[PDB]
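Quick one: co-fold with magnesium ion.
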Amino acid sequence: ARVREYSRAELVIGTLCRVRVYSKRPAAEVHAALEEVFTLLQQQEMVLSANRDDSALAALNAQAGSAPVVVDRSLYALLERALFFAEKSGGAFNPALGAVVKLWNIGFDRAAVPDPDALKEALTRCDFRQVHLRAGVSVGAPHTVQLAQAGMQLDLGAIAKGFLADKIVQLLTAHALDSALVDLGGNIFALGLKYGAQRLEWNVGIRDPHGTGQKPALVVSVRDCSVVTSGAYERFFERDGVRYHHIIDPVTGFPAHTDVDSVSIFAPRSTDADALATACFVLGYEKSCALLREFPGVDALFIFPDKRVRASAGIVDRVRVLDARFVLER
Ligand SMILES: Cc1cc2nc3c(=O)[nH]c(=O)nc-3n(C[C@H](O)[C@H](O)[C@H](O)COP(=O)(O)OP(=O)(O)OC[C@H]3O[C@@H](n4cnc5c(N)ncnc54)[C@H](O)[C@@H]3O)c2cc1C
Ligand SMILES: [Mg+2]
Ligand SMILES: [Mg+2]
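Sure, here it is.
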């Protein structure tokens, strides 16, 4: 049995999703697995999307301030984890920010900042402590979500790719695959080891925050790890000389003003890395380091505006600088 390398990529969940696999299984078995990967991504776009009218999440949002809504166990577990990170981060990650983000999302499409009062009114409808998850303990009891606060809107944009990465890994493993690189719009899971037969860690790139994005600034060797990066220049609009990026500080209702240009989180679960990367970007370096003390199994890499890079002890030895303008502090 020979090792063969496969890759498939599609536009789905609003971005480029690619999976690369090394396997000695019959090719028809890899092909079936990859068919299922991209079917899952299509199906889940219709569960999770905050910017289609026809998703499960949109239907849930169209019921805020009313009665509990039944959701599948998958979505329920995602919401549970999201509310967990909202609590732990002190609301720096907030999965009930849709009132605010939708005010800004229209701002992107036409390069205009929301509106003082409107933005203030929106911030009153983002209390994630008013999302009530309940699931009976009897056989086959349904999972339900209640949005108690009128006009509150869920938006799982900052955790859904992680969730989907984790679900893809689980599917790959179900297909007896154990070597893959999953890349959902830059949200990476490195499953197993790659082949060089010599087995080697995956070398995950971290971009220059201000790059044209073509090339990484740094590379980190990892196994069985998600790598998720949040940054200040990944998605933004400009108006009157001011850049407005997509990661909102829930306290201000404006794009977060922070002391880091990017934060990359390394975790066994991509769900966690995705939430935490967004939380840490909002929180800034010192407060991030205190939060991450809560999560001893996670590592982190910060790129500062002066191009210094600090990485936690679990990963610093695995970092290689490719763009010599950056400096890795040790
Ligand atoms: C299922 C699905 C379907 C999608 N469909 C589309 C599409 O059709 N078209 C398209 O252009 N993009 C789409 N996206 C991408 C989506 O709009 C993201 O909102 C955006 O690209 C940012 O993701 P990130 O992973 O780069 O950043 P992250 O930092 O992981 O997430 C930032 C996003 O989370 C939300 N948010 C902002 N601030 C906070 C915060 N403090 N706490 C929590 N959440 C916050 C906003 O939605 C913001 O865009 C989709 C994503 C998913 C999961
Ligand atoms: Mg995120
Ligand atoms: Mg993300």
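If it helps, The chain has eight helices and 21 strands.
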